[PDB]
């Protein structure tokens, strides 16, 4: 499992979304987590929405096993569908 995060270093809710993946990475051995800047790196929600195939407006901006999965919102609901299911 590979989970990739676009822009931690820029806002607290994006950090919380990153931290959720890192927290899961702490909890298990299957689950690997990756952080990539967008505000530093010169990337934006206009780039991310094209790559993802879906018009995005705001954060979070996460991908799981190379696929777009929102982040803190999607990820909490996804984690819940496993651990609270």
């Amino acid at each position: 499992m590979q989970t990739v995060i676009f822009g931690r270093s820029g806002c607290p809710y994006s950090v919380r979304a990153k931290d959720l993946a890192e927290k899961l990475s702490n909890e298990r051995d299957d689950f690997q987590y990756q952080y990539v800047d967008i505000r530093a790196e010169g990337i934006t929600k206009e780039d991310l929405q094209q790559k993802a195939g879906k018009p995005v407006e705001t954060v979070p901006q996460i991908f799981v096993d190379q696929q777009h999965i929102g982040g803190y919102t999607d990820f909490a609901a996804w984690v819940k569908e496993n651990l609270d299911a």
């Binding site: 822009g7 809710y13 954060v59």
Partner: peptide, 25 residues
């Protein structure tokens, strides 16, 4: 006159899925 602008918080910090935050470059 001379004032400060403050935001009240009725909800708790509960960790479960806020979908937005307008963050970028």
């Amino acid at each position: 006159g001379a004032e400060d602008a403050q935001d009240d918080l009725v909800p708790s910090i509960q960790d479960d899925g806020s979908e937005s935050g307008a963050c970028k470059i």
